[PDB]
Write a protein that binds this ligand. Structure first.
Ligand SMILES: Nc1ccccc1O
Ligand SMILES: Nc1ccccc1O
Ligand SMILES: [Zn+2]
Ligand SMILES: [Zn+2]
Lengths: 300, 270, 299, 270
């Protein structure tokens, strides 16, 4: 019972980053694009290399579940993940190894706390495009076991405060399962900030002169929240989340951010911004809460 | 030119779990309407499911033959749904060019492992449609397209295919009431959640069998909000658009609950 | 004996100061160009750890016909108003110059065959570009500055010959630093892609309206930055002319060549602190830290 | 209406170092053209100098009274240039509004410590213009404006100002051949660099003297490139655009060298 969360990250999942990287798992070929955000993730990739995690846990908004919170429970899945909105940019062939023991643990800790939880045991299930993009941008070697958690739709079905409360319980249960696991975990919130976007796509999609924030209000909201995270004023960040989500149409309403902070026990330490960029007008920031550097977690 | 029109649910529960008699009634009804659909000798089937989302351009399926196996994101514990859907690549591309001319940004979708939605898959499998001799043309659910815009999109796709001298059968895939259970229940205790929606569901179905278009539009100004309809009932508006806002009446083959949702298999008389 | 501890590409867009809202600048913004300001936050941190004794800067906004000039006054103070962006830049400056290193820099340039002059007029106004770079690298204004002008040989004579004259100025600048015994930081105050917007956005800090002016400009910027990160500087200088012609880069002024010539053209991997756009022009903050690379001693 | 027109050099060498006989000649000629400019009894002086740059909008000086001191960026070792320039705010703002109506993005410049160029300062001090009884209207040199565009700007300003019933004296501030010396030289050896440049200057000046407008235009096809004229000779297109391409002749009050550049003081017979 010696396990602990070593780092937390806001790992956005825009498929343009993978498109622009032209890795061998992606079928489309690009001439570049979104270089600032790819350099932002290069810094996060270096943190991960020194953190040496035992498991990566992702919460994605592109795996929507109505009956509770699901966890992937098969040892391995392989297939081709084609983004349904950007199939010209993302046609990825994935081969993922999951940590079933720890996913099972998080499911048992969520039922004890009162949430509805299920284990995905189907072996032909296709993991979502967002979970695969966040994982490849954080660790493209695909050599670290994954826990994949679905995004329960209570925030869009009932009230936005009720749904976010369920994400707080989920995070509290994740921490309980991590500590008992004996493993060194890294949480990844696959969420975008401002999600106001372009209604039309630039002819060469990677033409970066057609890339800018969609709204002035969204960029401003994104800059206000990132600065607060860089100063460690997380309490104020969570006081404003409902207004940020409504005024900037934020993708942190899925619950990954609240789940990640609840599992870290809502820390008020300064976050390191790895970088920020727009992807079809949406605001995407790579933010990290390195608890090994804070002294709250042990070094490798 | 439009020779048949049907509304079928998109849940996979009736095709993955037919041991539950409550859910088995939809499979049979759906199997029955396919026989009636096939009896009208259509040349192509126009499908619009609520589970296939589009966000930027309007998407049209254009893969000649899409052969794969799908596992539902919510109902992954009941099995898988294999499919072999053949599309009319010429007609689908003509619909993409028809939107463009009307100022509607459109593009095709022809990729291996493209995520076809569960609603389009079970409607094609249950109605035995989307085959080599009876192919389909599927339009996506753009989320920024409202009820009135969906009628214009259905109206445009029918005119386009009607001018090529083809006989069209049109299906709208989607449910009725949208409130569903959020906990694991025993399937025999299934029933539509609130009674308001049940009466609302019963009332709107009643107007469809009567052929009262004028009264149907009056009921449609509150039905979507009152019954918490799935996707704002845009899949019925798709059907309306292809029938030019009028049908003589309809035949409800079955109306029931699907995990709290209100579903129905309806057949329209042209 | 002295040595160069770090070399940085330090752009001079007045918008960055405007966005920061320091006490020295009269007009106030509501925000803006945050990704480039965070880039300079990381550069500032290196300057706090490097602890240099003098900052040397080459600016394209101090153009001179007769040779290369070096400010040679004790201190200058007054107000600098940008002639193109006076709604964003009205800075009250107070700068202290390293007179002795400037005189040595002027003496070594004359020895190498360049034409040099010292600026001793006490009412001279230091250029807005030099003031911007210095405030974004060290806003405490507590490090002596050596200000060098940009000789116009690159636009008046040839262009490879003009850059050759900048190579000579950099070698002479290193000779003076080595005999000074001071730890120096060079600041090449240059932009990359310089195709820019012909019109300004009404709220100037409306980042909704900020994007690269051309596709080829950004593409040329990304090619050259990635090359700088890999350490392929020899290939970077072979592509400099084409980059300057095709992307209208502001490295044509000569600070880039001046700085790398004084570092003896290192092929060490550079560190990108960040890249951003300012009315369409490409701006990178990039650092060659000779201390962390074990070729200059620590503080 | 236009009442006087002059071309004067923008170098500060005649005003900072008038102990050099060769450079003092331009100073006294410039002092003489101000006397002739005040004899035309103008109500405003319209000035365009090559050293005041604009890169976005066209800038008009709208500061009522601009009182300051300026040290040249190149000739800082010879002294400082103090100035007290009063501008006609109403007329400057009228030109801003007139430009906007012709689709020329324009704005004003009313800021304390704003950097006025060395050329506008020495022209206002030597010709004794820009005072309280004789205000000035200064237009900037947009670098994306060409010769044709500069003539249109002058006509725009001369039309706008003539409608308010003001007599205008117009000045273009700039040199002729632009090849300077790039080394420190004895001022007593100042001469024009290349003889070809020397000859072109004398030729474009003789065409002015005789008012041969047709031959001047022909010469202007090649003068800027052959003489490496300052700023594409745009400041002379400022004068042409203000006179509508016609004048009767000209008086050359002085021609010579200023650190290798060609420079002249020219009064124009309207
Ligand atoms: N899914 C996604 C796609 C593009 C940009 C941002 C996003 O969150
Ligand atoms: N001087 C300047 C101003 C704006 C953008 C880029 C620049 O180099
Ligand atoms: Zn998303
Ligand atoms: Zn510049």
């Amino acid at each position: 019972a010696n396990g602990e969360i070593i780092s937390g990250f806001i790992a956005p999942h825009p498929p343009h980053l993978v498109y622009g990287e032209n890795p061998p798992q992606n079928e489309p070929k690009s001439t570049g694009g979104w270089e600032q955000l790819r350099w932002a993730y290069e810094r996060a990739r270096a943190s991960i290399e020194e953190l040496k995690p035992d498991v990566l846990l992702v919460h994605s908004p592109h795996w929507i579940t109505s009956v509770g919170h699901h966890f992937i429970g098969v040892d391995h899945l392989q297939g081709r993940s084609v983004d349904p909105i950007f199939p010209n940019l993302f046609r990825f062939d994935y081969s993922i190894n999951f940590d079933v023991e720890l996913s099972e643990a998080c499911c048992e800790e969520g039922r004890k706390a009162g949430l509805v939880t299920k284990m995905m045991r189907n072996p032909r299930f296709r993991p979502d495009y967002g979970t695969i993009t966040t994982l490849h941008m954080i660790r493209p070697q695909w050599d670290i076991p994954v826990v994949s958690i679905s995004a329960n739709n209570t925030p869009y079905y009932l009230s936005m405060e009720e749904g976010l409360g369920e994400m707080d319980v989920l995070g509290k249960a994740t921490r309980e399962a991590i500590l008992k696991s004996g493993k060194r975990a890294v949480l990844l919130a696959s969420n975008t900030l401002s999600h106001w976007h372009f209604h039309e796509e630039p002819v060469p999609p990677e033409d970066m002169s057609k890339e800018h924030p969609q709204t002035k209000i969204g960029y401003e909201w994104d800059m206000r929240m990132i600065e607060l995270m860089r100063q460690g004023r997380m309490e104020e960040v969570f006081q404003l989340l409902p207004q940020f989500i409504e005024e900037a149409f934020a993708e942190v309403k899925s619950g990954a951010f609240t789940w990640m902070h609840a599992a870290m026990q809502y820390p008020n330490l300064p976050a390191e911004l790895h970088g920020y960029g727009t992807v079809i007008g949406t605001g995407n920031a790579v933010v990290e809460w390195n608890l090994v550097k804070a002294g709250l977690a042990r070094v490798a | 030119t439009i020779v048949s029109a049907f509304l079928v649910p998109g849940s996979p529960l009736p095709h993955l779990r037919p041991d539950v008699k409550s859910w088995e009634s939809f499979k049979v009804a759906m199997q029955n309407v396919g026989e009636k659909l096939r009896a009208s000798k259509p040349d192509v089937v126009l499908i619009y499911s609520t589970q296939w989302f589009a966000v930027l351009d309007e998407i049209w399926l254009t893969r000649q033959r899409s052969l794969d196996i799908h596992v539902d994101e919510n109902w992954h514990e009941f099995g898988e749904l294999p499919y072999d859907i053949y599309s009319d690549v010429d007609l689908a591309n003509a619909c993409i060019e028809s939107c463009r001319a009307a100022g509607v940004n459109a593009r095709g979708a022809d990729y291996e492992s493209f995520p076809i939605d569960t609603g389009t898959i079970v409607a094609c499998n249950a109605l035995k449609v989307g085959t080599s001799d009876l192919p389909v043309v599927v339009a996506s659910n753009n989320l920024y397209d409202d009820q009135a815009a969906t009628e214009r999109l259905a109206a445009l796709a029918v005119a386009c295919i009607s001018e090529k001298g083809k006989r069209i059968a049109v299906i709208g895939v989607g449910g009725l009431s949208g409130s569903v259970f959020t906990t694991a229940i025993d399937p025999a205790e299934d029933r539509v959640v609130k009674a308001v929606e049940d009466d609302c569901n019963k009332n709107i179905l009643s107007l469809m069998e009567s052929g009262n278009i004028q009264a149907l539009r009056e009921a449609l100004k509150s039905y979507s909000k009152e019954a918490r309809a799935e996707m704002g009932f845009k899949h019925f508006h798709w059907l309306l658009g292809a029938l030019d806002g009028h049908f003589k009446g309809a035949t409800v083959h079955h109306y029931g609950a699907l995990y709290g949702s209100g579903a129905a298999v309806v057949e329209f008389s042209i």
